[PDB]
């Protein structure tokens, strides 16, 4: 949503 | 016969999903220090949103995330790297 | 640095010696049991409690199992008469 | 006891 993001494995 | 995975989770694993009061979220039972949060979308089909303390599930997808604000819905520290998984019901 | 590893998995039925198991308190039967998806009850032998420091839930390893049958309606396991069940000895898994 | 008894699969 806004307080966290997807990152690269 | 299937057995419950306890770490290094992958899609298709049978997993144990437990309520984590400290983090105000359902998580995958695990022996690793790494957090695997149950995606919000998964709760209704699992009968975990009207709570029930546990349920068996099967991982259907898995996402690597990082907390960018000190206040977040996962109650984890700023910068924490964690996984979010979607799971569906499993039965024998 | 990245590394690969084997991981044991928790058995949930048809338990065998050497299985990794989840040991939980069954309030309905006043006893610790193995977590299972099947109708058969696997009760933790009372001898196994002190070394598990149960003398909520524990990971354990099955060491022995014994098939049993209740011969009285009133028993320590709170199972109906004629119920067939297992007693298991297990040690902790840390 | 005689509360419960050992059983085994028949062979
Ligand atoms: Cl903040
Ligand atoms: Cl950050
Ligand atoms: Cl392990
Ligand atoms: Cl006993």
Residue numbers in the entry:
A (entry chain C): 175 to 183
B (entry chain A): 1493 to 1542, 1551 to 1592
C (entry chain B): 1487 to 1541, 1553 to 1591
D (entry chain D): 175 to 185
Give excerpts from the publication.
As a core molecular machinery in mammalian autophagy, the ULK complex is composed of a serine–threonine ULK1/2 kinase, ATG13, ATG101, and FIP200 (also named as RB1CC1), and functions as a master regulator in the initiation of autophagy under the nutrient deprivation condition by linking the upstream nutrient sensors with the downstream autophagy machines. Here, we discover that the interactions of FIP200 Claw domain with autophagy receptors CCPG1 and Optineurin can be regulated by the phosphorylation in their respective FIP200-binding regions. In all, our findings uncover a general and phosphoregulatable binding mode shared by many autophagy receptors to interact with FIP200 Claw for autophagosome biogenesis, and are valuable for further understanding the molecular mechanism of selective autophagy.
Consistently, using quantitative fluorescence spectroscopy-based assays, we demonstrated that a 13-residue synthetic S177-phosphorylated Optineurin LIR peptide (‘SSEDpSFVEIRMAE’, referred to as p-Optineurin LIR) can directly bind to FIP200 Claw with a Kd value of ~12 μM, which is ~27-fold stronger than that of the un-phosphorylated Optineurin LIR peptide (Kd ~307 μM). To further uncover the detailed interaction mode between FIP200 Claw and p-Optineurin LIR, we also determined the high-resolution crystal structure of the FIP200 Claw/p-Optineurin LIR complex. As expected, the structure of the FIP200 Claw/p-Optineurin LIR complex is composed of a symmetric FIP200 Claw dimer and two p-Optineurin LIR molecules, each of which mainly forms a short β-strand and directly packs with the β4-strand of FIP200 Claw domain in an anti-parallel fashion. Particularly, the aromatic side chain of Optineurin F178 occupies the LHP of FIP200 Claw, and forms a unique cation-π interaction with the positively charged FIP200 R1584 residue. Meanwhile, the hydrophobic side chains of V179 and I181 pack against the aliphatic side chain of K1568 and the SHG of FIP200, respectively. Similar to that of p-CCPG1 FIR2 in binding to FIP200 Claw, the highly positively charged K1569 and R1573 residues decorated around the LHP of FIP200 Claw are neutralized by three negatively charged E175, D176, and p-S177 residues from p-Optineurin LIR. However, in contrast to that of p-CCPG1 FIR2, the phosphate group of the acidic p-S177 preceding the crucial hydrophobic residue that occupies the LHP of FIP200 Claw is coupled with the FIP200 R1573 residue by forming two specific salt bridges and one hydrogen bond, while the side-chain carboxyl group of Optineurin D176 forms a salt bridge with the side chain of K1569 from FIP200.
